[PDB]
Amino acid sequence: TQNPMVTGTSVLGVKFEGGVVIAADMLGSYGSLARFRNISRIMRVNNSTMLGASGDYADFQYLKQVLGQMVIDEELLGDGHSYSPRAIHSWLTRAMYSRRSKMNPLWNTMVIGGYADGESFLGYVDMLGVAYEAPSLATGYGAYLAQPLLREVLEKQPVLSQTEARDLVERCMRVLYYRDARSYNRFQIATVTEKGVEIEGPLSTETNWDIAHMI
């Protein structure tokens, strides 16, 4: 892919006590025009791991097609095994690195959240095959904006509960509405626990405009 037509925007993610929460908006902009106001940018993988992505959306439907097939292909065996969230992070990195070596890359930036064996997982995948782990992730302009808010709280307090983490994401998703030109005031929140993958509905923000009455 040389020219990304329909792109997304920033995707957030942070660990807490026994789970990982990931949020992103629902916008399908083409350049400056917001052509698609209602799309889903978070994919629920089987029971423990979970994927949200940025970049080109037509490439995301391709990886939604392939990852959806591989999970079905193991469940039909029924041998009591499944893909760990780290194994999805390993496969996806080799898929992106082998794709850029042919000089025909996939225009994406992907965040993998997972919870298995009582352990949280939060992985980053770049277009260029750059991958790492972190207690908090942010893509796009969110790495400039929400990422200083993430690292500030996690250094003053290393562990977080679920209600502390979910309230902190809504503060950062509020901020990106003010100064990202490709933001959208309707987003959804996905969360893994020991109970499984759960995706909340199209939530909205609460804005302040009291500085408009100033000169």
Binding site: T93, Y97, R100, M103, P105, L128, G129, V130, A131, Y132
Partner: protein
């Protein structure tokens, strides 16, 4: 249009001792004017006597590490033994040249013990030429570390100073002093210091914090 390369920073240091080898690196991963993480060490325990360091483009560092670890198993079941330190440096030179016209953007330093029990440090280039040295410093802060180690380890430009070999304890504080001075003037260096010590009794690790800016 699409460009396949990007710079990620990093600094790798190796010192060949008389009966030891010390490999040190920082854990800061950056790109452009952003910090991805503050915990990403560059040390990789290949065998019980060989540690490799990989700087440069991070996507090639993850690929090249897994290729070498596959060929370690491919050597062993074909030969009923493990590779030496010099055998890995001979194998790595053929792998780096195998993509001569689309090169890895990785600077490599291999440090470890030979078959006689002495230190050995091999430095590399992104195309695959190598030589055995006593101390090298690769990465973004490579120019800020080579002149100081010429004064202290190599005893260059000194008068009326005996050539005592570097002990283990004296070598530890030389590593801890160069990364403090390098993190001041370089922006791609900080947040930790992972140190691996390779002796005849195994591999030790040690972490020293740096400034977090």
């Amino acid at each position: 249009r699409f460009s396949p390369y990007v710079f990620n920073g990093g600094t790798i240091l190796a010192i060949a001792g008389e009966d030891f080898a010390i490999v040190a690196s920082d854990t800061r991963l950056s790109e452009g004017f952003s910090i991805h993480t503050r915990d990403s060490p560059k040390c990789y325990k290949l065998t019980d006597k060989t540690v490799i360091g990989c700087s440069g483009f991070h996507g090639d560092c993850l690929t090249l590490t897994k290729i070498i670890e596959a060929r370690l198993k491919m050597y062993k079941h074909s030969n009923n033994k493990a590779m030496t330190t010099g055998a890995i440096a001979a194998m790595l030179s053929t792998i780096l040249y195998s993509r001569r016209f689309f090169p890895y953007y990785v600077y490599n330093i291999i440090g470890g013990l030979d078959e006689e029990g002495k230190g050995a440090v091999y430095s590399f280039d992104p195309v695959g030429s190598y030589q055995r040295d006593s101390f090298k410093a690769g990465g973004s802060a490579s120019a800020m570390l080579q002149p100081l180690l010429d004064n202290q380890v190599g005893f260059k430009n000194m008068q009326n100073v005996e050539h005592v070999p570097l002990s283990l304890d004296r070598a530890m504080r030389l590593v801890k002093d160069v990364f403090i001075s390098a993190a001041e003037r370089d922006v791609y260096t900080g947040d930790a210091l992972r140190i691996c010590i390779v002796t005849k009794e195994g591999i030790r690790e040690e972490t020293v914090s740096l400034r977090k800016d």
